[PDB]
C-alpha cells in the first residue's frame, strides 16, 4: 500500500526513498501514539494517515472514513443553496466516484462549467462545497487575465525574477492546498 | 442612411447595421422593384443562413411592388432548393412577382398582415421587331405565364383553370381574401 | 452630413451617429415622403427596440408631408403588433398618411406640438387604360378609402359619418383642434 500510495501522491521524490520514509515514519508514529502495551502490528490505516500528511491531504481522502459526510453532502448543500438542486447532485456524484476509487487515474476529480445567468448562486454552491468538505477555496477572476502578458503569471514569473519560492500563482496555489476547490470566474473573457 | 446598432458579445461589443443585425436572426427584407442585383443579394443571404443552421426557418418580409420575372425565379428556386422553410410575410403590398414569392413559402409559414394588399396579374412584356422575331418572344412570354400559373396552382392549391381566369386581368386580394384564395395560411396576429 | 456623437461606456468610448444614438434612447425619427425603403427602415428600428425592452415605450416623431399609402400600412401594422406603446409626437407637417400614424399611436401617449399642422385628406391616386382595368383600380381605391376611414374612427373614436365628411375634401387641422377630434391626446406640457 505504502509504495502504491506514495507513487500516486508523492511525485516530487523518487520511489525507493518515499516508500522508506513513510515506513520509518509509520513505525515511529506507532511508538509515540500508545501509552503502554498496545498493538504492535501496523495497519494500513496508520500507513494511509502518514502518507496523507506528507502530501498535505487532510487524512479523509485516503480512505472513505467519513462516509457520513458524503451521505448528507447533497442535503447540506441543498439547504444552504435554495434552487438549482440539479446542479448539486452532479458535483456530489463526482466526489463519490473518486473517493470510491472509480475516478480518473490521470485527470482531476471533476471538470465542470457552470453556464447560467449572472447573480445565480454558481459561486455560492462552490463556496458551500469547500466549507462543507473542509478544503481551501481558490477563486481566480479571469477578467484580470484577458491580455497575453497576464497569462504568463499563471505558469511562470516576470522575466528577471528568480521566483524560487513563489513561482506561478495557479501552479503553486494548488501545492499549498492539494485538496481544494479551484474556481474561475468569467472564463469566457479569459 | 442606415442606423447602426450595438449587440453584446462575451469578448466585446459588436456593432452592426440595422439590416445586418436582422440577418443574424434569419430575417431577410425584400423591398422595391425586383432586379437581378437586389435578387442576387437575397439569394446570397439565403445560402448564408442555411449553413449557419439548416434546420431553423428563414423569414422573408415582402414589401415589393413587382419586378422582372427572371430574377424572381432565382429567389423562388433558391427557396425550394434549400432545406430551411422560408416564412413569407406580406408587408404593405405584394404584386404579381411578390405574391408569387409570397405563396412560394412553406405550407404553414405563409402570412399576411391584416392591412396588407395582394395584387396578381399576368406577366407584362413587349417586343418591337420583325414578325419572325416577335413570334419567338410571344411564345416565350406565353410559356412563362404557363410556368407561373402551374406553380401558383401548386402552392395555392387552386386549379389551373381558376388561376387563368383570375390572372387574365389584374385583381386585388385583401388580407382575409388571401387566406380563402389559398395564398397564405392565416393572418399574423399571434405566435 | 450627419454628425457623430461620442458615447460614454465603462470599457471605452464609442462613436455613433446622432440618429443611431437616439435609437439607444428608443427615439425613432420619420421625415420625407413615405416610401417603401424608408418604411422598412422604421420597421427595423421598431423590431430592434422591442427585443431590447418590450415594456419601455417607444417615441416616434413625424415630420412627413405624406406618401404612398401601402408602405404606411407596414408601419401601422407593426406598431399595433409590437407590444411597446409608440408615443407619436407630431413635430411638423402631417398629411393624410402622416396623420394616420399619429392616430395609430397608443392612447394616452399621443402628442402634438402646439404649432404643428395636421391635414387629412382622402387617398389620391389614378390609373389610365382600358375601362375594364380602370374598374378594378377604381374599386380598389374606394375599398382602401373605407379601410383607412374605418381605422381612423377606431383610434379617434368618431363616427364613420364624421370621418367621411372631414376626409372627403382636403382639411387642415391645428394642434388644439386635434384634441377635440380625438386625433391626439394632448399637447406636450414641457
Ligand atoms: N440559490 C441561492 N441561494 C442562496 N443565496 C444565493 C443563491 N444564488 C445566489 N445567492 C446569493 O447571491 C449572491 C451572489 O452569488 P454568487 O454565487 O457569487 O453569484 P454569481 O455566480 O453570479 O457570481 C450571494 O450573496 C449569494 O449568497
- Angle in degrees, 0-180, between the axes of helices C131-156 and C69-81, rounded to the nearest 10: 30
**Residues comprising chain C, all counted:** 190
Q: Which three cell numbers stand for residue B115?
A: 392591412
- Measured between CA atoms, how close is A123 to chain B, in angstroms? 19
C170's grid cell: 382636403
The active-site residue out of B64, B96, B116, B155 is: B96
Cβ atoms of residues C173 and C158 within 8 Å: no
Name the grid cell of A13.
Answer: 521524490
Q: Is the dihedral of CA B12, C15, C86, B33 positive or negative?
A: negative
Distance (Å) from CA A135 to ligand 1 centroid: 20
Out of C96, C137, C159, C190, pick the active-site residue. Answer: C96
Strand C27-28 and strand C14-17: the pairing is: unpaired
Mutate to test the interface with B, among C70, C80, C145 (most CBs of B within 10 A): C70
Beta-strand ranges (E) seen in chain C are 4-7, 14-17, 27-28, 58-62, 86-90, 111-112, 118-120, 171-173
Count other C-beta atoms under 10 Å from residue B17's C-beta: 14
- Counting atoms of ligand 1 from 1, which one is nearest the CA of A122? 21
Where helices occur in chain B by DSSP H, the ranges are 18-24, 36-52, 69-81, 96-103, 131-156, 160-167, 175-181
| Distance from the B9 Cα atom to the nearest Cα atom in chain A, whole angstroms | 10
Q: Cell for A89?
A: 447532485
Q: Residue B142: what are its φ and ψ, rounded to 5°?
A: -65, -40
Which H or E run includes C99? helix C96-104
User: What b/e string do you get for C155-173 counting C-beta neighbours within 10 Å, with b at 16 or more?
Assistant: bbebeeebbbebbeeebeb
Experimental method: cryo-EM
Determine how β-strand B14-17 pairs with β-strand B4-7.
antiparallel
- Helix, coil or strand: residue C109: coil
Question: Torsion over CA of C89, C70, C35 and B49, rounded to 10 degrees?
Answer: 100
Closest CA to A185 of A133, A129, A132, A122: A122
Task: Decide whether any atom of ligand 1 lies within 6 Å of the A163 Cβ.
Answer: no
Report d(CA B184, CA A10) in Å as an integer: 74
Q: What is the 3-state secondary structure (H, E, C) of chain C?
A: CCCEEEECCCCCCEEEEHHHHHHHCCEECCECCCCHHHHHHHHHHHHHHHHHCCCCCEEEEEECCCCCHHHHHHHHHHHHHCCCCEEEEECCCECHHHHHHHHHCCCCCCEECCCCCEEECCCCCCCCCCHHHHHHHHHHHHHHHHHHHHHHHHHHCCCHHHHHHHHHCCEEECHHHHHHHCCCCECCCC
Chain A residue with Cα closest to B11: A189
Question: If you take atom 18 of ligand 1, which residue's CA is the nearest one?
Answer: A123
Any ligand 1 atom below 6 A from CB of A41 = no
Burial A75-101 (b: 16+ CB within 10 A, else e): ebbbebbeeeeebbeebbebbbebbee
- CA A188 to chain B, closest CA, distance in angstroms equals 6
The sign of the CA dihedral A87, A90, A93, A99 is negative
* All cell numbers assigned to B41: 443579394
CB pairs under 8 A between A and B: 4
Rg (CA), chain A: 20
Q: Do β-strands C4-7 and C14-17 pair in parallel, antiparallel, or remain unpaired?
A: antiparallel
CA A175–ligand 1 middle distance (angstroms): 28
Of all helices (H) and strands (E), which one includes residue B41? helix B36-52
Amino acid at each position: 500500500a505504502a509504495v502504491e500510495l506514495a507513487v500516486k501522491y508523492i511525485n516530487d521524490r523518487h520511489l525507493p526513498d518515499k516508500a522508506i520514509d513513510v515506513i520509518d515514519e509509520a513505525g515511529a508514529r506507532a511508538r509515540l501514539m500508545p501509552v503502554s502495551k498496545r498493538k504492535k502490528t501496523v495497519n494500513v490505516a496508520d500507513i494511509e494517515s502518514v502518507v496523507a500528511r506528507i502530501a498535505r491531504i487532510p487524512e479523509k481522502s485516503v480512505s472513505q472514513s467519513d462516509r457520513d459526510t458524503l451521505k448528507n453532502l447533497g442535503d447540506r448543500l441543498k439547504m444552504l443553496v435554495f434552487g438549482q438542486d440539479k446542479a448539486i447532485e452532479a458535483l456530489t456524484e463526482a466526489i463519490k466516484m473518486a473517493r470510491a476509487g472509480l475516478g480518473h487515474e490521470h485527470k482531476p476529480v471533476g471538470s465542470f462549467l457552470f453556464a447560467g445567468p449572472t447573480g445565480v448562486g454558481k459561486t455560492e454552491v462552490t463556496v458551500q462545497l469547500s466549507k462543507a468538505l473542509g478544503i481551501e477555496l481558490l477563486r481566480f477572476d479571469m477578467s484580470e487575465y484577458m491580455e497575453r502578458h497576464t497569462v504568463s503569471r499563471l505558469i511562470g514569473a516576470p522575466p528577471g525574477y528568480v521566483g524560487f519560492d513563489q513561482g506561478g500563482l495557479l501552479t503553486d496555489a494548488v501545492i499549498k492546498h492539494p485538496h481544494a476547490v479551484l474556481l474561475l470566474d468569467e472564463i469566457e473573457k479569459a | 442612411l442606415v442606423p447602426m446598432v450595438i449587440e453584446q458579445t462575451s469578448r466585446g461589443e459588436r456593432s452592426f447595421d440595422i439590416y445586418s443585425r436582422l440577418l443574424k436572426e434569419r430575417v431577410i427584407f425584400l423591398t422595391g422593384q425586383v432586379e437581378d442585383h437586389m435578387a442576387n443579394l437575397i439569394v446570397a443571404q439565403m445560402l448564408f443562413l442555411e449553413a449557419e443552421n439548416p434546420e431553423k426557418d428563414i423569414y422573408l418580409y415582402i414589401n415589393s411592388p413587382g419586378g422582372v420575372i427572371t430574377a424572381g425565379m432565382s429567389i423562388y428556386d433558391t427557396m425550394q432548393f434549400i432545406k430551411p422553410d422560408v416564412s413569407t410575410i406580406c408587408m404593405g403590398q405584394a404584386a404579381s412577382m411578390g405574391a408569387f414569392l409570397l405563396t412560394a413559402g412553406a405550407k404553414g409559414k405563409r402570412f399576411c398582415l391584416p392591412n396588407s394588399r395582394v395584387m396578381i396579374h399576368q406577366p407584362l412584356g413587349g417586343y418591337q421587331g420583325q414578325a419572325t422575331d416577335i413570334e419567338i418572344h410571344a411564345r416565350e412570354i406565353l410559356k412563362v405565364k404557363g410556368r407561373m400559373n402551374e406553380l401558383m396552382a401548386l402552392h395555392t392549391g387552386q386549379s389551373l383553370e381558376q388561376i387563368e381566369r383570375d390572372t387574365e386581368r389584374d385583381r386585388f386580394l385583401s388580407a382575409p381574401e388571401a387566406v380563402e384564395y389559398g395564398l397564405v395560411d392565416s393572418i399574423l396576429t399571434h405566435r
